[PDB]
Amino acid sequence: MDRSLRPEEIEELREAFREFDKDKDGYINCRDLGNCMRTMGYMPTEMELIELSQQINMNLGGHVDFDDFVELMGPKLLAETADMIGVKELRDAFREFDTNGDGEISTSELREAMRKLLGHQVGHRDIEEIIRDVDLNGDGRVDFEEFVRMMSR
Ligand SMILES: [Ca+2]
Ligand SMILES: [Ca+2]
């Protein structure tokens, strides 16, 4: 996957998984598959549902353990955009970067959040890169609108 799943995300998937597994009586249909992807904040397309349901229903033959489930659904959860997430959760994400709660993400606050997300330290040069990429109003910090875009296509 693009990056490692956070503990809160593993719990989101665990919850999706219980729903998936209750629903699954041998096989899984698209209404069900779709709904428990929604349980984890992701709106699938019917194309996606057909692919996924065929994988689950033919290849694994209905035997999906949590590990299988995370291989399939992991990427989708990581791929959620701003408009699926909702405001309160975006707010929360932002919070987590804005450790001092002053409504602005400082370049060292970015550094820590990036370290925690990617699971390794990020270079001085790279973090400077990110800011210039991200800051619309050219004040060297990251605010909420700025941060939302960072997760918007
Ligand atoms: Ca801050
Ligand atoms: Ca800014």
Side-chain angles (χ1 to χ4, degrees), residues 1-17 19-21 23-30 32-87 89-115 117-124 126-127 129-140 142-144 146-153:
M1 336 216 178
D2 277 343
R3 68 155 166 100
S4 7
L5 293 165
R6 283 315 284 357
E8 19 133 16
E9 319 184 311
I10 281 145
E11 322 287 325
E12 286 193 80
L13 288 159
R14 262 234 143 263
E15 199 186 348
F17 186 64
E19 195 185 332
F20 172 82
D21 193 15
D23 296 7
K24 192 182 53 157
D25 187 355
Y27 291 104
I28 193 81
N29 63 77
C30 306
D32 296 4
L33 189 50
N35 267 340
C36 85
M37 292 184 87
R38 306 221 174 83
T39 300
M40 39 145 69
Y42 181 84
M43 256 306 302
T45 68
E46 171 72 15
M47 203 44 243
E48 292 187 290
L49 263 12
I50 290 158
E51 276 142 11
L52 285 176
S53 54
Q54 300 289 315
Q55 219 114 61
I56 284 162
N57 289 170
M58 170 181 314
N59 318 347
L60 268 4
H63 295 80
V64 189
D65 66 10
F66 182 70
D67 261 349
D68 310 333
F69 191 83
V70 169
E71 291 203 72
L72 304 156
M73 311 283 55
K76 305 268 166 303
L77 158 52
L78 290 181
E80 289 163 14
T81 53
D83 19 304
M84 339 177 93
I85 284 147
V87 202
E89 260 211 81
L90 285 169
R91 182 63 184 116
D92 272 343
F94 185 76
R95 197 162 272 143
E96 275 157 356
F97 285 52
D98 185 18
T99 47
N100 83 353
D102 85 324
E104 208 77 19
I105 299 167
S106 71
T107 104
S108 75
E109 252 159 10
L110 197 53
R111 177 109 173 180
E112 269 298 304
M114 243 42 196
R115 193 192 153 280
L117 263 191
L118 311 173
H120 67 269
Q121 253 138 134
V122 167
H124 30 300
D126 298 338
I127 288 280
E129 218 220 340
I130 286 152
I131 294 292
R132 278 156 18 205
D133 283 353
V134 141
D135 200 346
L136 295 166
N137 62 33
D139 88 316
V142 186
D143 77 56
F144 187 81
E146 263 158 6
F147 174 93
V148 172
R149 297 206 353 165
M150 226 179 133
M151 282 103 204
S152 272
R153 306 192 180 286

mmCIF file of all heavy atoms in Angstrom, residues 50-69:
data_model
loop_
_atom_site.group_PDB
_atom_site.id
_atom_site.type_symbol
_atom_site.label_atom_id
_atom_site.label_comp_id
_atom_site.label_asym_id
_atom_site.label_seq_id
_atom_site.Cartn_x
_atom_site.Cartn_y
_atom_site.Cartn_z
ATOM 1 N N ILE A 50 -17.948 -4.932 -8.492
ATOM 2 C CA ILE A 50 -17.932 -6.117 -9.304
ATOM 3 C C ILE A 50 -16.564 -6.780 -9.250
ATOM 4 O O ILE A 50 -16.465 -8.033 -9.121
ATOM 5 C CB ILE A 50 -18.269 -5.812 -10.760
ATOM 6 C CG1 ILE A 50 -19.753 -5.412 -10.938
ATOM 7 C CG2 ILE A 50 -17.991 -7.041 -11.605
ATOM 8 C CD1 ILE A 50 -20.054 -4.594 -12.192
ATOM 9 N N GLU A 51 -15.499 -5.975 -9.352
ATOM 10 C CA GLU A 51 -14.143 -6.543 -9.273
ATOM 11 C C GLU A 51 -14.000 -7.213 -7.933
ATOM 12 O O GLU A 51 -13.701 -8.373 -7.855
ATOM 13 C CB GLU A 51 -13.062 -5.486 -9.452
ATOM 14 C CG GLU A 51 -12.768 -5.198 -10.881
ATOM 15 C CD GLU A 51 -12.482 -3.719 -11.191
ATOM 16 O OE1 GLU A 51 -12.292 -2.826 -10.277
ATOM 17 O OE2 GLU A 51 -12.455 -3.460 -12.423
ATOM 18 N N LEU A 52 -14.245 -6.464 -6.867
ATOM 19 C CA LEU A 52 -14.009 -6.982 -5.559
ATOM 20 C C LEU A 52 -14.864 -8.203 -5.270
ATOM 21 O O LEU A 52 -14.384 -9.205 -4.720
ATOM 22 C CB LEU A 52 -14.163 -5.905 -4.495
ATOM 23 C CG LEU A 52 -12.947 -4.966 -4.494
ATOM 24 C CD1 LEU A 52 -13.110 -3.811 -3.520
ATOM 25 C CD2 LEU A 52 -11.721 -5.706 -4.140
ATOM 26 N N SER A 53 -16.135 -8.145 -5.630
ATOM 27 C CA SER A 53 -16.979 -9.281 -5.301
ATOM 28 C C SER A 53 -16.545 -10.529 -6.064
ATOM 29 O O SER A 53 -16.453 -11.603 -5.475
ATOM 30 C CB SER A 53 -18.424 -8.975 -5.530
ATOM 31 O OG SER A 53 -18.532 -8.536 -6.850
ATOM 32 N N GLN A 54 -16.244 -10.397 -7.349
ATOM 33 C CA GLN A 54 -15.603 -11.519 -8.047
ATOM 34 C C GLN A 54 -14.305 -12.054 -7.403
ATOM 35 O O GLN A 54 -14.177 -13.243 -7.212
ATOM 36 C CB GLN A 54 -15.335 -11.161 -9.485
ATOM 37 C CG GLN A 54 -16.550 -10.832 -10.176
ATOM 38 C CD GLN A 54 -17.340 -12.061 -10.374
ATOM 39 O OE1 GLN A 54 -16.791 -13.085 -10.774
ATOM 40 N NE2 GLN A 54 -18.640 -11.998 -10.082
ATOM 41 N N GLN A 55 -13.339 -11.212 -7.065
ATOM 42 C CA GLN A 55 -12.218 -11.710 -6.323
ATOM 43 C C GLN A 55 -12.641 -12.498 -5.110
ATOM 44 O O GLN A 55 -12.289 -13.666 -4.962
ATOM 45 C CB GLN A 55 -11.422 -10.592 -5.777
ATOM 46 C CG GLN A 55 -9.928 -10.822 -5.824
ATOM 47 C CD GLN A 55 -9.303 -9.826 -6.773
ATOM 48 O OE1 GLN A 55 -9.378 -8.582 -6.599
ATOM 49 N NE2 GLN A 55 -8.708 -10.368 -7.818
ATOM 50 N N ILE A 56 -13.376 -11.865 -4.216
ATOM 51 C CA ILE A 56 -13.779 -12.527 -2.992
ATOM 52 C C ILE A 56 -14.560 -13.785 -3.261
ATOM 53 O O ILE A 56 -14.343 -14.786 -2.611
ATOM 54 C CB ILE A 56 -14.630 -11.647 -2.171
ATOM 55 C CG1 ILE A 56 -13.782 -10.609 -1.478
ATOM 56 C CG2 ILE A 56 -15.306 -12.436 -1.126
ATOM 57 C CD1 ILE A 56 -14.574 -9.437 -0.987
ATOM 58 N N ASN A 57 -15.468 -13.740 -4.225
ATOM 59 C CA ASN A 57 -16.349 -14.882 -4.484
ATOM 60 C C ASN A 57 -15.746 -16.029 -5.314
ATOM 61 O O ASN A 57 -16.009 -17.195 -5.044
ATOM 62 C CB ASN A 57 -17.664 -14.413 -5.067
ATOM 63 C CG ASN A 57 -18.489 -13.720 -4.067
ATOM 64 O OD1 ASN A 57 -19.481 -13.119 -4.413
ATOM 65 N ND2 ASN A 57 -18.101 -13.797 -2.811
ATOM 66 N N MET A 58 -14.929 -15.724 -6.305
ATOM 67 C CA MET A 58 -14.259 -16.799 -6.972
ATOM 68 C C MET A 58 -12.888 -17.190 -6.366
ATOM 69 O O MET A 58 -12.717 -18.301 -5.868
ATOM 70 C CB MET A 58 -14.126 -16.482 -8.423
ATOM 71 C CG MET A 58 -13.213 -17.467 -9.093
ATOM 72 S SD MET A 58 -13.215 -16.860 -10.737
ATOM 73 C CE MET A 58 -15.002 -16.630 -10.872
ATOM 74 N N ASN A 59 -11.927 -16.270 -6.399
ATOM 75 C CA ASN A 59 -10.526 -16.639 -6.168
ATOM 76 C C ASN A 59 -10.289 -17.171 -4.729
ATOM 77 O O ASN A 59 -9.696 -18.208 -4.510
ATOM 78 C CB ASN A 59 -9.555 -15.447 -6.468
ATOM 79 C CG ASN A 59 -9.904 -14.637 -7.751
ATOM 80 O OD1 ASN A 59 -10.695 -15.047 -8.562
ATOM 81 N ND2 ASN A 59 -9.287 -13.452 -7.892
ATOM 82 N N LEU A 60 -10.741 -16.405 -3.747
ATOM 83 C CA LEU A 60 -10.626 -16.800 -2.337
ATOM 84 C C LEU A 60 -11.719 -17.846 -1.988
ATOM 85 O O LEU A 60 -11.656 -18.492 -0.914
ATOM 86 C CB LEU A 60 -10.695 -15.560 -1.416
ATOM 87 C CG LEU A 60 -9.375 -14.887 -1.039
ATOM 88 C CD1 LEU A 60 -8.146 -15.506 -1.720
ATOM 89 C CD2 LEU A 60 -9.410 -13.380 -1.333
ATOM 90 N N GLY A 61 -12.698 -18.019 -2.907
ATOM 91 C CA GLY A 61 -13.914 -18.828 -2.676
ATOM 92 C C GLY A 61 -14.685 -18.503 -1.398
ATOM 93 O O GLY A 61 -15.016 -19.392 -0.639
ATOM 94 N N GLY A 62 -14.939 -17.232 -1.121
ATOM 95 C CA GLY A 62 -15.583 -16.864 0.133
ATOM 96 C C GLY A 62 -14.799 -16.985 1.443
ATOM 97 O O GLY A 62 -15.306 -16.543 2.476
ATOM 98 N N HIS A 63 -13.586 -17.568 1.436
ATOM 99 C CA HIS A 63 -12.707 -17.611 2.653
ATOM 100 C C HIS A 63 -11.760 -16.425 2.797
ATOM 101 O O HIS A 63 -10.689 -16.438 2.290
ATOM 102 C CB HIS A 63 -11.910 -18.911 2.744
ATOM 103 C CG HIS A 63 -12.768 -20.119 2.939
ATOM 104 N ND1 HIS A 63 -13.432 -20.737 1.893
ATOM 105 C CD2 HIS A 63 -13.090 -20.814 4.060
ATOM 106 C CE1 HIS A 63 -14.118 -21.764 2.358
ATOM 107 N NE2 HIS A 63 -13.927 -21.834 3.670
ATOM 108 N N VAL A 64 -12.166 -15.390 3.496
ATOM 109 C CA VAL A 64 -11.362 -14.199 3.597
ATOM 110 C C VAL A 64 -11.097 -14.039 5.068
ATOM 111 O O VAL A 64 -12.012 -13.914 5.879
ATOM 112 C CB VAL A 64 -12.158 -12.955 3.067
ATOM 113 C CG1 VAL A 64 -11.296 -11.712 2.947
ATOM 114 C CG2 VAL A 64 -12.880 -13.283 1.745
ATOM 115 N N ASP A 65 -9.841 -14.059 5.426
ATOM 116 C CA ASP A 65 -9.502 -13.705 6.777
ATOM 117 C C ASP A 65 -9.215 -12.194 6.929
ATOM 118 O O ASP A 65 -9.209 -11.438 5.962
ATOM 119 C CB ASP A 65 -8.326 -14.542 7.267
ATOM 120 C CG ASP A 65 -7.027 -14.249 6.534
ATOM 121 O OD1 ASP A 65 -6.932 -13.288 5.779
ATOM 122 O OD2 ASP A 65 -6.066 -15.009 6.738
ATOM 123 N N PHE A 66 -8.943 -11.746 8.140
ATOM 124 C CA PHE A 66 -8.747 -10.330 8.271
ATOM 125 C C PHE A 66 -7.606 -9.836 7.411
ATOM 126 O O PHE A 66 -7.712 -8.770 6.771
ATOM 127 C CB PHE A 66 -8.606 -9.897 9.712
ATOM 128 C CG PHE A 66 -8.448 -8.440 9.867
ATOM 129 C CD1 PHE A 66 -9.495 -7.589 9.612
ATOM 130 C CD2 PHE A 66 -7.233 -7.907 10.262
ATOM 131 C CE1 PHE A 66 -9.324 -6.211 9.732
ATOM 132 C CE2 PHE A 66 -7.062 -6.546 10.394
ATOM 133 C CZ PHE A 66 -8.106 -5.701 10.125
ATOM 134 N N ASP A 67 -6.531 -10.616 7.367
ATOM 135 C CA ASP A 67 -5.389 -10.305 6.479
ATOM 136 C C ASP A 67 -5.701 -10.090 4.979
ATOM 137 O O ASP A 67 -5.370 -9.046 4.416
ATOM 138 C CB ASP A 67 -4.352 -11.362 6.612
ATOM 139 C CG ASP A 67 -3.207 -10.963 7.547
ATOM 140 O OD1 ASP A 67 -3.077 -9.764 7.955
ATOM 141 O OD2 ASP A 67 -2.409 -11.883 7.864
ATOM 142 N N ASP A 68 -6.389 -11.052 4.365
ATOM 143 C CA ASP A 68 -6.964 -10.881 3.044
ATOM 144 C C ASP A 68 -7.756 -9.595 3.019
ATOM 145 O O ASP A 68 -7.548 -8.737 2.143
ATOM 146 C CB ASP A 68 -7.914 -12.017 2.657
ATOM 147 C CG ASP A 68 -7.327 -13.406 2.878
ATOM 148 O OD1 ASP A 68 -6.092 -13.524 2.837
ATOM 149 O OD2 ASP A 68 -8.097 -14.380 3.125
ATOM 150 N N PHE A 69 -8.690 -9.440 3.958
ATOM 151 C CA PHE A 69 -9.572 -8.262 3.925
ATOM 152 C C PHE A 69 -8.744 -6.963 3.877
ATOM 153 O O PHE A 69 -9.065 -6.030 3.114
ATOM 154 C CB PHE A 69 -10.476 -8.238 5.150
ATOM 155 C CG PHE A 69 -11.559 -7.232 5.077
ATOM 156 C CD1 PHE A 69 -12.737 -7.526 4.405
ATOM 157 C CD2 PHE A 69 -11.411 -5.988 5.706
ATOM 158 C CE1 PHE A 69 -13.756 -6.625 4.382
ATOM 159 C CE2 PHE A 69 -12.452 -5.057 5.695
ATOM 160 C CZ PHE A 69 -13.624 -5.364 5.036
#
